[PDB]
Design an enzyme around this catalytic site. Structure first.
Site, PDB file in Angstrom:
ATOM      1  N   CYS A  74       0.801  -0.822   0.148  1.00 23.67           N
ATOM      2  CA  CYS A  74       0.082   0.058   0.137  1.00 23.67           C
ATOM      3  C   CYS A  74       0.673   1.286   0.154  1.00 23.67           C
ATOM      4  CB  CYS A  74      -1.086   0.182   1.166  1.00 23.67           C
ATOM      5  SG  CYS A  74      -2.167  -1.186   0.532  1.00 23.67           S
ATOM      6  N   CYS A 135      -3.148   2.039  -3.365  1.00 23.00           N
ATOM      7  CA  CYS A 135      -2.651   2.348  -1.843  1.00 23.00           C
ATOM      8  C   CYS A 135      -2.517   2.613  -1.149  1.00 23.00           C
ATOM      9  CB  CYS A 135      -3.073   0.416  -1.537  1.00 23.00           C
ATOM     10  SG  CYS A 135      -3.592  -0.002  -0.029  1.00 23.00           S
TER      11      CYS A 135
END
Length: 213
Positions: A74, A135
């Site tokens: 992420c 992300c």
């Protein structure tokens, strides 16, 4: 075949391809061991083989994009865990390849250098995907040397910055790189970064900018 001016497909492509794909999915990124590198290669060749190396579309690589299930860290995505760090990016890095209408193989004699070629189209597509897969907090390195460090005409301001999902990515962080040589003024206050800024904000995302040496 079709005579070109650019370099030919990298000698030993398929091998270099599968070889890199294996080293990736099997040892470097073991969580992707279930990825079939042969299938990935074939699905790749289909995008351009038997086709004109200057008539390749974004759709030719769509299947490839659908086939690969990429592992995405992420808060580590960085535009410019980079694109060259993904399975596909690590594979096609610095490689050349193209096809030819009068064949079902790859041109080892010469390839184009015609903006819709095998090479250019591949990177654009995997860049868009890469963006969509981002992300959390995404980064981006910008050249503090340039006048307008940020320019829509780049793969970044064109599609990458607009393919970022706000639901997954809540913040974009621009890194304006500078050299000790040169009084590189704070480009974070210029227009290019103020535009890139509005774009991100206008898309319900927080924008941060920094000037580093």
């Amino acid at each position: 075949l079709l005579v070109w001016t650019g370099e030919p497909t990298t000698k030993h492509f398929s091998d270099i391809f599968l070889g890199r794909c294996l080293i990736y999915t099997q040892i470097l990124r073991p969580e992707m061991r279930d990825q079939n590198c042969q299938e990935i290669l074939s699905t790749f060749k289909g995008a351009f083989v038997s086709k004109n190396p200057c008539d390749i579309t974004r759709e030719d690589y769509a299947p490839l994009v659908k086939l690969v299930t990429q592992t995405i860290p992420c808060d580590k995505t960085l535009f410019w865990f980079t694109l060259e760090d993904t399975l596909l990016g690590y594979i096609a890095d610095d490689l050349r390849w193209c096809g030819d209408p009068s064949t079902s193989d790859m041109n080892y004699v010469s390839c184009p250098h015609c903006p819709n070629n095998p090479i250019t189209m591949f990177w654009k597509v995997i860049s868009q995907k890469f963006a969509e897969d981002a992300c959390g907090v995404v980064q981006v390195m910008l050249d503090g040397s340039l006048r307008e460090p940020f320019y829509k005409d780049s793969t970044f301001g064109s599609v990458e910055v607009f393919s970022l999902d706000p639901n997954k990515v809540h913040k974009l962080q621009a890194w304006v790189m500078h050299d000790i040589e040169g009084a590189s003024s704070n480009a974070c206050s210029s227009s290019s970064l103020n535009e890139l800024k509005m774009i991100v904000q206008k898309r319900n995302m927080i924008f941060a900018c920094v000037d580093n040496y």
